[PDB]
Write a protein that binds this ligand. Sequence first.
Ligand SMILES: [Zn+2]
Lengths: 94, 94, 97, 98, 358, 109, 109, 85, 81
Amino acid sequence: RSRKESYSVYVYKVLKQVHPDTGISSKAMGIMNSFVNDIFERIAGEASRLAHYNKRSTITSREIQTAVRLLLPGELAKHAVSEGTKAVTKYTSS
Amino acid sequence: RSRKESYSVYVYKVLKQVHPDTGISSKAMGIMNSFVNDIFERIAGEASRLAHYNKRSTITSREIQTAVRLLLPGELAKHAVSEGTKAVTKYTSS
Amino acid sequence: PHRYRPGTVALREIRRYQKSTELLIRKLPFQRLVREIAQDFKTDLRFQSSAVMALQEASEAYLVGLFEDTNLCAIHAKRVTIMPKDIQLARRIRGER
Amino acid sequence: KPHRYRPGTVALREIRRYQKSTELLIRKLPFQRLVREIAQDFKTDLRFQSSAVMALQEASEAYLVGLFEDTNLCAIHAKRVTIMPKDIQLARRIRGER
Amino acid sequence: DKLKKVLDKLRLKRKDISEAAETVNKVVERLLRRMQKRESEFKGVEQLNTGSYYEHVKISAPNEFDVMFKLEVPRIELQEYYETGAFYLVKFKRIPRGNPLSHFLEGEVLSATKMLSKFRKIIKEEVKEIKDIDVSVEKEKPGSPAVTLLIRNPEEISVDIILALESKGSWPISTKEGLPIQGWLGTKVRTNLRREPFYLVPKNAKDGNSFQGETWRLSFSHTEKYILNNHGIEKTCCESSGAKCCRKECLKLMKYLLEQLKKEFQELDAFCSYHVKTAIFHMWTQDPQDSQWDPRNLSSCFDKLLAFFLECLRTEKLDHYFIPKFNLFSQELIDRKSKEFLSKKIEYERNNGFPIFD
Amino acid sequence: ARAKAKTRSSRAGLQFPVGRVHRLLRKGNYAERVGAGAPVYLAAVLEYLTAEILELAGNAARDNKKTRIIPRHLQLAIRNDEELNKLLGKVTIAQGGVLPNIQAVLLPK
Amino acid sequence: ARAKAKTRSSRAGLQFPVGRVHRLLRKGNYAERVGAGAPVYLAAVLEYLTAEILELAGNAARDNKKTRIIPRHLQLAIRNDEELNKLLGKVTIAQGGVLPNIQAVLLPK
Amino acid sequence: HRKVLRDNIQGITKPAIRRLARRGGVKRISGLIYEETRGVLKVFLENVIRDAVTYTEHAKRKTVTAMDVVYALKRQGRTLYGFGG
Amino acid sequence: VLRDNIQGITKPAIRRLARRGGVKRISGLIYEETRGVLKVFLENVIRDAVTYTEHAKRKTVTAMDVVYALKRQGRTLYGFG
DNA sequence: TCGAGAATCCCGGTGCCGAGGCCGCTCAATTGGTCGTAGACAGCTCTAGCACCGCTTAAACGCACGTACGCGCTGTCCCCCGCGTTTTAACCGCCAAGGGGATTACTCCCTAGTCTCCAGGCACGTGTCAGATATATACATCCGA
DNA sequence: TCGGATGTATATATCTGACACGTGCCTGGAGACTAGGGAGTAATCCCCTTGGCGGTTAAAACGCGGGGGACAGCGCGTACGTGCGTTTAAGCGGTGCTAGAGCTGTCTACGACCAATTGAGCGGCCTCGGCACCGGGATTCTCGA
Ligand SMILES: [Zn+2]
C-alpha cells in the first residue's frame, strides 16, 4: 500500500505558535492543505512564464519576488516580500 | 541582425484556397498571427496539465484529442476532431 | 389567534438561515437528478459518494449567488418582490448569455 | 422659420453613424499627457514607445464602450431612457469589480 | 487578641478614606466624560476597575489614589527582551485600513515616551477646564510615567493616572504554565479566565540607556480581582449562604506587617505588596481547602504563612504566579542584605507578639 | 545513398508546417517527452480553424465590394456566429468597431 | 567522515520544508533548471500566508467559545478582510455559509 | 435493475427554492420564480457533468471520482476547496 | 511635471463613447463618474506594465509589456504582438 | 395626407503608396542508426457501490383569509437637447540631438548528475476530553387596545 | 403605552467518538565530489525618442429657448404570506453481493540523441492597381400645415 504526501504536520506546527492551546478539526486541515497547494501552483506558474518571456531558462529568486509582487494585492505584497528577503539572507550567511 | 518567425506564409497559402482572388492587408495578418499563437498555447497547456493528472509523462495524440474536445464549444468539436483523425491516418500509412 | 403581520416571519427566517451552515436541498432527489442527467453522455456510470456531495455544494453556492444579485436588481427598480425579468437581467449582465 | 428637428432625432442619426465607423474617439495628445502623469508615481523618467500608448488607448475605449452598453440595459430595466450614476454603480457592482 | 483589634482598626480606616475615594471617583468620572466627548486618538479610553478596598490596592497614604486608563489597540505583536520574559517590546502586524498610530512609531517600535507625552499634554489641557473643583496636574517627575493630579477640595489629594494598553489576542507564550489552579477550581474556570484580554503598562528597565521609554510590562489586574472575589472551592464560600474564611484577613495582616516594617525601616523600600500576593497565591494553591482557614484559626494560619515567607527569603526564589520563570526575589532585584534585614525583623515581630502593630 | 527528402506536411496532406510545431512543443516545456503523433493532429486542428475564420471573413468582405480584408471584416465574421463568438468571448480586436444594434424601446413610436 | 546532517529548514529558520518544495519545482516542469535560491524564498512566502489565515481564523473561533476550528470560521476570517478577500474572490469553501447581511430597504419603517 | 429515470427535476421542491432564496437575503418571492430557477439549475448541472465525464473517459474508468468533479469546476473559475487536490 | 490632465477627457468625447454604446439621453452627472472609472482602470494596467518592464532592467515601456499586463486580467488584446 | 427642406447614397475622374512577387542565402529540418526506459498487459486482491427491507417521524402538500404591494393614471416643472457664434489648441510637416536598445566576445562559477547513508515523516493503534444533546429556565421582542 | 403572548439565549447534566499522540520502519534528503555551459560584463553601433517651431482649420466652449421626461401623488384589486390539518417518502440501521479500482511482475517498441547534408523561408528589394479622395447629381426621410 503506497502513501500520499500532505501538509498536515507543517500547518499544525505553525498553528502551535500563534495560538498555543487551540486545535484544528480534520475538515479545516483539508481546506488548509488545498489552499497551500493552490497558492504554490499559482506562484510557480507565473514565475515560470515570466522567466520564459526574457529568454532565460532558470528560476532565480528574483523571478519569485516579481511573481509575488504581481499576484498579492496591496499591502500584503510589501510585507510578504520583506519576509522572503530576510529568510534568504539568513540562509546565505550560514 | 537576427530574424523572427511568423505564420504569414502559411496563412496566405490557406487563404489562396478558399478565396482564390482576394488578398489580405498587413493588419489582418498581424491579427491572424496572434490568433494562431493564442489557440496553440491554450491547447498545448491544457494537454500538458491533463497528461500530468494521470501521472504519465508524455503527450500522445489521445491527449490532444481530449483537449480539443474540452475547449471548443459544441459542433466545432465534432468537426475538428474528425479532421485530426483523418490526417493522422494518412500520415501512418506512408 | 395570534397572527403575525405579513413580512415578519420572513425576517426571522432570514436571520436564521444566514447563520447555520448545513445543506438546504434534500439528498436523494438530488442524487436521482444527477444520475438522470448523466445518462445521456454515457451508459452505466457509477458515482462515488463524495462526487455527489461536491456537485451539491457547488450548485448550492451558485444559486445563492444568483438570488443575491437578483435581489439587488429588484431593489434597484423601486420594488421589493423579484420576478423572472430580474433573473434574466442579472444573468445577461454577468456574461452568461 | 428655422427648421428644427424635434428632440431625440439627431441622437438616433449620430448613433447610426458611430456604430458604423472605426476611428478612435479620444484625441491623442490629451490621452498621452494623462498616461504620462499617471505613470509618474511608479517610477521616474520613463520613456513610452508610441505603440504602447496606442495599445493603452484601444483597451480603454473598449472597456468604456462595454460599460455603457450594460449601464444602458440597467437604465431601461427601470422604466426610463436616461442613464444616471446609480446605474453605473449598480452595473459595476454586479460585474464583480467591487 | 491584637489581631482582631487590628482588623477592627483597619476596617474603621475605610470610614476615613470613603470621602476621599468619592471625590476621586467624581473627578475621574468628569475627566473620563470629557475625554470621551472630544474627538482624538484617545476617544475610547476607559477606567479599568481594580478595586478600592485595602485588600486590592498597594500600600498608600489614606489620601493617595491610583487609577488605570485603558485603550484599545489592533493586532499587536510582542517580542521578548530579557531571557526571563520580564520585559516586552511592541510592534504592529499588517493593518489593511491604515495604522491610526502610524505617526507615533519610532522605527518599527511604538515609543511609550511620545504616547505618554501626548497623554500628559491632553490631561493638562482638560484639567485646565475643570472649573468647579481646584484640580491641577503635578509637575512631571522625570523617571515616573504617571500623570499625577492634585485635587484641592480643600485638602490635597494625589491621583496617579497610568495609561494602559488593552489587547485581545492570545495570551503570551511565556504565561503558558502560569495560573496553576487546575485542581483548586477545575480546568473549566482556568480556561474561561485564559479566554480574556490582557493589559500592557509602560515600565522602564534598569539596564542602560537603550530602549528606555520603549518597554512594557504585562498586567492581569482583572483576573486577580476575579479570583479574589470568587475564591472558594464551594460556590457559596464567603457568600451570604456560605461560610466565611480568614483568607483575606491573613493577607491583610501580612500586608500590614510589611507596611509597618517599611515605615519603620526605609531599608525595606524595594519590597512591595505584589511580592506578598505572589507568595500567598502559592500558599492558597499548595493548601486549597477552605477548612485550612476557619476564622477560629486565623492566627494559626498567619503563622504558617510566616514560615513560608522566611523560606522564600532563605532560598531567594519567588516565581511570578503568571510568569513562572520570573523570579521576584532575584539577587539583581533585591539585595541579599535587605532580605536578611527583613528576616531579622519578621523573626523579632513573630517572637515578640508583633509590637509593631501597637 | 540518402533518398530524396519529403517534408512531413506533404506526407500528411496539410498546409501548416509540422516540423515547426514539433519544435515548439519540445522546447516550450509542456511535458518531458512529446510523442510522434501529436504534431500532426495539432497542425490539422489549427489549419481547420484558420480555414473557418478566413472563409467567413472573405464572404463578408466580398459582400460590400472590396478585394482585400481589413479588421472590420474579421470583427463582423467573428461576432456574427454562434460558436466562434463563444470561443473568443473575451478578446478585443483592434480597430474593430461594434455590431449595428439599437434597442427597441428607444426607436420612436 | 561526514558531518552531522542539518536540514535546510533549520538553516533558514522556517517551518515549511524546503527539500520538498525543491523536488516539486524540479519535477513539475516549470523551467529547465531551478536555481538554488528559489525554494527558500517560496517556502517563506507560503509560510507567511498560512500564518496569516490561521491567526485570523483562530481569533474568530475563540470569540464565540470554541476550542477547535471548523470551516465556518475560515469562511468568516477570509471574507471579512480587504486584501485576503480579493486574493480568493472566486473560491468556494465547502460548508461555509455566508456573511450576515440584510439590505437597508427591506427592514421595516 | 438498470431503471432509466424520467421527470426527476420536480424533486427540487418549492420550499427548497424558498430556503435558498431566504439565505440569499430576499423578502417576497413571486410565483413564477420556480420554473426559471429549475431551468437555470439544469443548465449548470449539464455544463459541469459533461466535463466530469470527459475527464473520466480519458482515463479509461467507470467511476466518476471526486477529483474529476473538482477539476471540472476549477476549469470554469469556480475553484472548490475541501474535497481533495 | 504635470498636474490636472484628467480634464483633458472632454465632455463631447464621453458623449461620443456613449453614442457608440447605444444610449439616447445622457444625464448631467455622468462625466464626474466616468473620469474616476477611467482613472482606476489605467492605474491598474500601468502599474502591472511598469512592473513587467522594471523586472527586465529597461526604461522603455514597450508594447508587448502592455499586452501582457492586459492579458493577465482576462482582457486579451489581438493586434500588437 | 401632402410640399419643402436637409442629409445621405451613388457615380465618375485623379493620384499614390502599400501589397505582391523575385532573388540569395543560411540555418533549421530530414535522413539514418543506436539504446535505454516508459508504457502495455496479464494476473491477482479486496474495498466500496449497489441493491433491498422495515419503520419512525419530519417535511411537503393542500386550503382559507386577507392585507399590503404592484400597477396604472394625472399632473407639474425643471433639466437636457438643438442650434449658433466665438475662441482655443490639436495636427501636420520638418529639423536636430543623443540615450539607450540590441548585438558581439569571452570567461568563470553555479547547477546538474552520482553514490552513500541515515533520520524525518507516514501508516497504525489507543485513550480520554470537547462537543452534541436534552431540559429547564430567564430574557428580549411583537401586537392590539 | 402596557400586558400578554411567543420566541430565543443561557445554564446544567449526560454520553460518545475523533483527534492528539506514541511506536515502528522505510525511502528520500543531505553531504561530497566532479564537469560544462549559461549568463554576466565590457565595448560598440545606430535607431528611435524627445524636444521645438510655425502655420491651418476643426472642434470645443458658451449661451438661449423650449418641448418632454422624471418624479410625486393617489387609487384600486389580485396574489402571496400565515397558519392549520392531512398524507407521502426521506433518513436510518442493517444485510449481502461483486464489479472494478488498485497493485505487481515481465518484456518490447519507440523517442532522444547524435552526425551530415540541403532546400524552405526570410530580408531586402522594385513595381503598379485598389483605394482614398473630390465634386456633382439623384434618393430619401423628417416636419408643419
Ligand atoms: Zn473564602
